[PDB]
Amino acid sequence: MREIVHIQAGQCGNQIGAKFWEVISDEHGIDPTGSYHGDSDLQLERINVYYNEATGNKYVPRAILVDLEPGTMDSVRSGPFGQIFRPDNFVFGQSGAGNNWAKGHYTEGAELVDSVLDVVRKESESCDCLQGFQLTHSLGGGTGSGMGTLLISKIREEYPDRIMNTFSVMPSPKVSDTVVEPYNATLSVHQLVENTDETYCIDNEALYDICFRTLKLTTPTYGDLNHLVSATMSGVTTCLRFPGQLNADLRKLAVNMVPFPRLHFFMPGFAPLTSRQQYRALTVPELTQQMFDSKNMMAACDPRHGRYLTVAAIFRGRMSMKEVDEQMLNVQNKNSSYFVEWIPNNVKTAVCDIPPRGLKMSATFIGNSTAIQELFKRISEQFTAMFRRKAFLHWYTGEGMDEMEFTEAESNMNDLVSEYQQYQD
Amino acid sequence: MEVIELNKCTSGQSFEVILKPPSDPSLEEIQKKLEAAEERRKYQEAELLKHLAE
Amino acid sequence: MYTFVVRDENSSVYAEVSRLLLATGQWKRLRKDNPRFNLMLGERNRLPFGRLGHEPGLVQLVNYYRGADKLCRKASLVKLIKTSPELSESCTWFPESYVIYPTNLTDEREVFLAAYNRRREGREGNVWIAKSSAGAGILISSEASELLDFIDEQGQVHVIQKYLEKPLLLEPGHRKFDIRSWVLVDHLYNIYLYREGVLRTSSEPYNSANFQDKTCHLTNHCIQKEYSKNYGRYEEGNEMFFEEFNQYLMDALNTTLENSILLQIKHIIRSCLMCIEPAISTKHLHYQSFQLFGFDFMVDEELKVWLIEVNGAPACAQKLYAELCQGIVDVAISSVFPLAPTSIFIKLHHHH
Amino acid sequence: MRECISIHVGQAGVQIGNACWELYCLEHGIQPDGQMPSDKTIGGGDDSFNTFFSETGAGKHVPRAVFVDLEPTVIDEVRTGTYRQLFHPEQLITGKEDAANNYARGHYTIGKEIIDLVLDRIRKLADQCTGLQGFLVFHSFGGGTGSGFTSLLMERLSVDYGKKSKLEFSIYPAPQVSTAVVEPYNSILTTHTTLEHSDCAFMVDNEAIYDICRRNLDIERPTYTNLNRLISQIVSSITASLRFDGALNVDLTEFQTNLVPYPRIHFPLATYAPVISAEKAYHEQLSVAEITNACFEPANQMVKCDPRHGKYMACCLLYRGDVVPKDVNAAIATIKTKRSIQFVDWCPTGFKVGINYQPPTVVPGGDLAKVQRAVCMLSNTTAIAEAWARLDHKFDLMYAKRAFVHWYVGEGMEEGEFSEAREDMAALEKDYEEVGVD
Numbered sequence A: 001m002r003e004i005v006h007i008q009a010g011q012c013g014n015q016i017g018a019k020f021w022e023v024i025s026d027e028h029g030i031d032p033t034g035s036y037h038g039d040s041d042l043q044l045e046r047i048n049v050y051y052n053e054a055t056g057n058k059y060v061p062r063a064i065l066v067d068l069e070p071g072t073m074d075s076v077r078s079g080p081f082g083q084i085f086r087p088d089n090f091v092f093g094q095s096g097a098g099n100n101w102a103k104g105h106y107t108e109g110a111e112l113v114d115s116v117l118d119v120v121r122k123e124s125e126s127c128d129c130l131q132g133f134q135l136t137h138s139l140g141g142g143t144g145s146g147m148g149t150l151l152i153s154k155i156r157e158e159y160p161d162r163i164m165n166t167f168s169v170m171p172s173p174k175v176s177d178t179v180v181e182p183y184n185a186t187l188s189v190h191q192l193v194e195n196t197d198e199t200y201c202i203d204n205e206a207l208y209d210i211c212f213r214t215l216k217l218t219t220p221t222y223g224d225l226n227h228l229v230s231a232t233m234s235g236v237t238t239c240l241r242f243p244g245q246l247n248a249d250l251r252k253l254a255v256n257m258v259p260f261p262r263l264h265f266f267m268p269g270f271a272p273l274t275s276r277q278q279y280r281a282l283t284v285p286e287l288t289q290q291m292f293d294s295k296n297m298m299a300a301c302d303p304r305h306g307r308y309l310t311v312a313a314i315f316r317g318r319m320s321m322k323e324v325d326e327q328m329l330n331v332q333n334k335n336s337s338y339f340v341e342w343i344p345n346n347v348k349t350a351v352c353d354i355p356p357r358g359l360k361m362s363a364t365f366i367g368n369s370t371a372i373q374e375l376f377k378r379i380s381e382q383f384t385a386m387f388r389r390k391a392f393l394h395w396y397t398g399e400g401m402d403e404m405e406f407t408e409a410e411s412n413m414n415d416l417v418s419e420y421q422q423y424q425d
Numbered sequence B: 001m002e003v004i005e006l007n008k009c010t011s012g013q014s015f016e017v018i019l020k021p022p023s024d025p026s027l028e029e030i031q032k033k034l035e036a037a038e039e040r041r042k043y044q045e046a047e048l049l050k051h052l053a054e
Numbered sequence C: 001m002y003t004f005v006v007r008d009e010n011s012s013v014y015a016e017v018s019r020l021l022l023a024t025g026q027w028k029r030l031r032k033d034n035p036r037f038n039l040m041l042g043e044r045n046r047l048p049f050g051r052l053g054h055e056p057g058l059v060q061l062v063n064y065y066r067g068a069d070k071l072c073r074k075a076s077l078v079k080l081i082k083t084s085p086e087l088s089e090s091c092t093w094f095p096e097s098y099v100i101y102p103t104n105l106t107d108e109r110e111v112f113l114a115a116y117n118r119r120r121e122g123r124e125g126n127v128w129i130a131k132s133s134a135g136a137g138i139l140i141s142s143e144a145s146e147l148l149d150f151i152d153e154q155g156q157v158h159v160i161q162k163y164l165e166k167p168l169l170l171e172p173g174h175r176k177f178d179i180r181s182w183v184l185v186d187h188l189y190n191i192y193l194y195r196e197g198v199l200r201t202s203s204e205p206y207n208s209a210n211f212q213d214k215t216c217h218l219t220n221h222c223i224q225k226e227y228s229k230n231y232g233r234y235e236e237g238n239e240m241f242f243e244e245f246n247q248y249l250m251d252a253l254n255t256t257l258e259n260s261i262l263l264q265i266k267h268i269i270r271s272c273l274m275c276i277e278p279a280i281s282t283k284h285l286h287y288q289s290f291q292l293f294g295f296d297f298m299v300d301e302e303l304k305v306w307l308i309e310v311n312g313a314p315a316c317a318q319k320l321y322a323e324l325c326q327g328i329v330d331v332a333i334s335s336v337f338p339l340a341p342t343s344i345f346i347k348l349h350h351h352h
Numbered sequence D: 001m002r003e004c005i006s007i008h009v010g011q012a013g014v015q016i017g018n019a020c021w022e023l024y025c026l027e028h029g030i031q032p033d034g035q036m037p038s039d040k041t042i043g044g045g046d047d048s049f050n051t052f053f054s055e056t057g058a059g060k061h062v063p064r065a066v067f068v069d070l071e072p073t074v075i076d077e078v079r080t081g082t083y084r085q086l087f088h089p090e091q092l093i094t095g096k097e098d099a100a101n102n103y104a105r106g107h108y109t110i111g112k113e114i115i116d117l118v119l120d121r122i123r124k125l126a127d128q129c130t131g132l133q134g135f136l137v138f139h140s141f142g143g144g145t146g147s148g149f150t151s152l153l154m155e156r157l158s159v160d161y162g163k164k165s166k167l168e169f170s171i172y173p174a175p176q177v178s179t180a181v182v183e184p185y186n187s188i189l190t191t192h193t194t195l196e197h198s199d200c201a202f203m204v205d206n207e208a209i210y211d212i213c214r215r216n217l218d219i220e221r222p223t224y225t226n227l228n229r230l231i232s233q234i235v236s237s238i239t240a241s242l243r244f245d246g247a248l249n250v251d252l253t254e255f256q257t258n259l260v261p262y263p264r265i266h267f268p269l270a271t272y273a274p275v276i277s278a279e280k281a282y283h284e285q286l287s288v289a290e291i292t293n294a295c296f297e298p299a300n301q302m303v304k305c306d307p308r309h310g311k312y313m314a315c316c317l318l319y320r321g322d323v324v325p326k327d328v329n330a331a332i333a334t335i336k337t338k339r340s341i342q343f344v345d346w347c348p349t350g351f352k353v354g355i356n357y358q359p360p361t362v363v364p365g366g367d368l369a370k371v372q373r374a375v376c377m378l379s380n381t382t383a384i385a386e387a388w389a390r391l392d393h394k395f396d397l398m399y400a401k402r403a404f405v406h407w408y409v410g411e412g413m414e415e416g417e418f419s420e421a422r423e424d425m426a427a428l429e430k431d432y433e434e435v436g437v438d
């Protein structure tokens, strides 16, 4: 009984989180009303990891929905699986955050955070043995970014020896709501460098290019992007939701993926990614070739520009585990110039028999690559282009922030980039 | 090639064949090691809370 | 795409082998410390054999046989010949040798003097040579006092063996020489003899009444090119190849290189290598081994061949680097890692 | 009769323990309910099997074993498995969260809070022994519990049971069946703090058990069940002398005497033959000479290495099945004239031989085929140092960058214990070279 408390904050965080619970609920046999209707015992083996068991054999997600405006969470509550969430677990304000990190972190969010922690504390008190937390959010807005990182800071204070994990959507100018997204992302990244054990970096530009170039969607939507995040979130958590000795719990995964406390930002990947030739069976070689292909990766960073510190691959479906080892061992031995040589056996593989809905087999990719620095470089450059002229700062100084705090965030992330660079050589 | 110490019983036998002749920390000290590390953990957590309090 | 690492930058042989591998476009070189390799061109000394064959899904191959030093060390070869039943008793092709430790450190001092006193009493030629592996340091003398006293002044193990007072002398010139044969042993322990040998000749007339000047007695390529005044007179670089040497044996002695010398060389190579096969074979090992050997032979005036030493990391004659190195890739490397004649080697069949 | 207490620590130790006691029961004719029809002394007896089994008034035979794991999922298998009835709840100990493959977490953080409880459960077994010999400790090198908690348990056992012997069965880390990157760290930390507390240790390299399962049993991708059934076969061969009538290795003291002339070099190499697939049509039964000869082939060693380039300090031949001394000596004479067997000059060139007439028992439905005779050779070669070299090298690569070190310091371990442990291994490697090379 190793439970995980899930939190989703802000517009992006709740829409992605919503689809995440829609995907895994299907995989575990839970219907929109919480009743189990699967046909395999593996579905219920580790069900308590993400679901509480209520009266009448009902399974309620261990999820807390947070936002500073009601809009998005009314959509969730009226969505496909809206009824499955605990009504008490909806914590929301009315003012909104106006895409402002300072409002989510210092003013509006500060007024609402205590009641959010009252719900977290209530979900933890009912855990037999809490593993840790996972948060879904974007870094470019105000609530998921500013208040999300405020939550992490207070969750770490009350639960200092638990694992804090996040799925973080990084902003890109090509898929942007406001020009202040670099400001909010730079402020959040430093919070994450300090207070998270694992952060899956998801770049909205990578998601866009995949839908356009690979999936051949003429006009992608946020919904289309969230479909990829769903599938990926379902993939990375397969180790936790089904029986297996590899990457068993959150702390074991961290110990094997994080050689240095601050370099805990991962590039996730998924395969297949097929356009509607969608019924063709996919061979193991093809799964492995695609899974490692940059085009199938979601941080929008070219791995051939850096080096993998550690890699974790999860294969789902009924396949040849022998043929899996051969193809994995084939990729490592064919490109050993992108794997650091001072971490023996830094490529681990795991197998799972239950495939995602509608697929014979699939593979998920989790890489701790030094190429992630390119993502932070983009953000830093965009940040500095505006900060050198103090553009749009009044939105933030109006909420009590000082220019000195921006200068620190700038330096803190430039240091983060330098730390990656020294390990790439 | 010599055989020595041939012992036989109902369930087996054993012998020796020679081919060629030749030519702690106390209980107190363990508690200190454990308590020393427990203190270093308490110190590191205090520095974290002190950092979070600032 | 196969992968290999280079750990001996001073090897002219495998330097050329490394250049050829990259020429095929199907082999990739990795940093010398990268463990994910198919082939290792390893270091001469302290090659970490224990770290080979433990990489999941990688068939690893190395260019040295662990334990072959027993054959390529001066003192080791003498001990191996004398103690191996496959060699000692009927080893008529290795000069009488003795292992002698300097008195500042088993030792065959007394056994050597006994055989020495016997020769001196019987009027027989009593000229011995003292040498060691720590040399560029050689002394030839007919007095036991000088030989032993020269070894005590040093500090490493030495070997005293009979000096061939009746060597075969080429004409014109009246000059000594030795024969170098290159032998390749692959992972399956096949013994391939390179069809091309070299005679490292002395450019000075052999003088039997003055062992002080060691230029007409030592046929090493470096000594002839530094202390000899007739270097390069009779043949280019004091290197006569089999074609010419064979034609000489026909004109002068009315015999062939095969009949008079090659049979004995092929017999000696077999005896030495079959002897240690149970100790160094990688047939059932978690990794595979091959190695290039350099055998050195002497020939006396009766056309009897004698084994001088075996070299574990030999160099090759300039004119034969291309042909041999390509051969190492064909039978030694590509036989285990195939790519997408008239062999230059002579297989010496034997019972495994 | 003197008793032996078996301790199983971590997932590897517990699951291997479960496989050994399954084999012990089949060998001694014990049913899953603990009953033993052949035992005519009800509720007591000082027979050889009583070294590993106690008896209740109801005729139940209970293993003298303790299972310890900081997480309950593996031991829950034992609680509800086939042999659930054998053990009582006091023998099974589980925590709520594991050591996360972190030696420091199992040794310091979590170990400190559960060590006194384990010692209490062990003390209860010791109170049933009229003359306790010592302990057999099963554990992995890589696990945070197997490495971290074992080393602490060994330190305390030396204090609570000073005059008692302690043998180990240790699982050497192999990447083919491991998802942990830090296992070299744990392996070296636990060897350092355990070296002075273990009288004799049998290392089993998962890489060796893996290839044997693929090569001899024709398993394309072996599971832990396949590895553990083979491993418990070797363990049975090694502990048979303690459980059956005999005169060779009749107590834990004799293992050190016969196999370890130098206290630090206490890691004998184990070789087993023959391993035959049950799915085969029908195998030609091998002879004494052939299986004895197999003991000098790297392919059936528990740790892959080349004994041709080391030196032997001791050598034990344990046969089970249809073997007579005449055939053993005949085979040995042949092997000497063919193989490269160099002993150290301060030890006799000899072989202690033990023969148990009962052939190897095989788990019904398992992978191993019934054979008429088999042998396990225990030899103390300097060649096993290759294993330390490989391991120490991987340690050096990561520690040079201090990679993953923060996880250990975070649990209260000082960084200096890394180097202190490594320098001990460098000294251990020097001892092997001083004894084996010229």
Ligand SMILES: Nc1nc2c(ncn2[C@@H]2O[C@H](COP(=O)(O)OP(=O)(O)OP(=O)(O)O)[C@@H](O)[C@H]2O)c(=O)[nH]1
Pocket (backbone or CB within 6 Å): D009, D010, D011, D012, D013, D015, D016, D069, D070, D098, D099, D100, D101, D102, D106, D140, D141, D142, D143, D144, D145, D146, D147, D171, D172, D173, D174, D177, D178, D179, D180, D183, D206, D224, D227, D228, D231
């Ligand atoms: N032979 C064998 N090896 C095992 C088995 N289970 C785990 N291992 C090996 O043990 C190592 C991992 O250590 P574990 O024993 O699983 O860890 P632990 O002792 O439970 O400690 P924790 O970190 O708290 O989980 C890996 O190298 C595995 O290959 C097993 O059942 N049989």
Ligand SMILES: Nc1ncnc2c1ncn2[C@@H]1O[C@H](COP(=O)(O)OP(=O)(O)CP(=O)(O)O)[C@@H](O)[C@H]1O
Pocket (backbone or CB within 6 Å): C095, C129, C131, C135, C136, C161, C162, C163, C164, C165, C176, C177, C178, C217, C218, C219, C220, C296, C298, C308, C309, C311
């Ligand atoms: N017993 C002997 N009788 C006659 N000549 C001998 C001899 N031992 C050595 N030599 C001479 O010494 C020369 C080479 O000596 P040796 O081979 O022992 O030194 P070395 O090993 O440094 C040269 P290399 O390794 O290249 O063959 C030969 O050319 C040979 O003529």
Ligand SMILES: Nc1nc2c(ncn2[C@@H]2O[C@H](COP(=O)(O)OP(=O)(O)O)[C@@H](O)[C@H]2O)c(=O)[nH]1
Pocket (backbone or CB within 6 Å): A009, A010, A011, A012, A013, A015, A016, A097, A098, A099, A100, A138, A139, A140, A141, A142, A143, A144, A145, A169, A170, A171, A172, A175, A176, A177, A181, A204, A207, A222, A223, A225, A226, A229
């Ligand atoms: N992938 C994805 N990204 C989104 C979605 N909605 C907003 N974003 C991104 O998140 C950032 C805006 O943050 P938002 O969630 O709207 O701010 P918040 O409501 O204050 O937390 C911008 O960079 C958007 O591109 C969504 O549904 N999917």
Ligand SMILES: Cn1cc(C(N)=O)c(C(F)F)n1
Pocket (backbone or CB within 6 Å): A175, A176, A177, A208, A220, A221, A222, A223, A225
């Ligand atoms: C700013 N923005 C980008 C997108 C997109 N490309 O998918 C959307 C979505 F709402 F339509 N908004």
Ligand SMILES: [Ca+2]
Pocket (backbone or CB within 6 Å): A111
């Ligand atoms: Ca207000």
Ligand SMILES: [Ca+2]
Pocket (backbone or CB within 6 Å): D039, D040, D041, D042, D043, D044, D045, D046, D055
């Ligand atoms: Ca009884």
Ligand SMILES: [Ca+2]
Pocket (backbone or CB within 6 Å): B024, D158, D162, D196, D197
């Ligand atoms: Ca002791």
Ligand SMILES: [Mg+2]
Pocket (backbone or CB within 6 Å): A011, A012, A141, A177
């Ligand atoms: Mg918004």
Ligand SMILES: [Mg+2]
Pocket (backbone or CB within 6 Å): C309, C311
């Ligand atoms: Mg030489």
Ligand SMILES: [Mg+2]
Pocket (backbone or CB within 6 Å): D010, D011, D071, D098, D143, D145
């Ligand atoms: Mg465990």
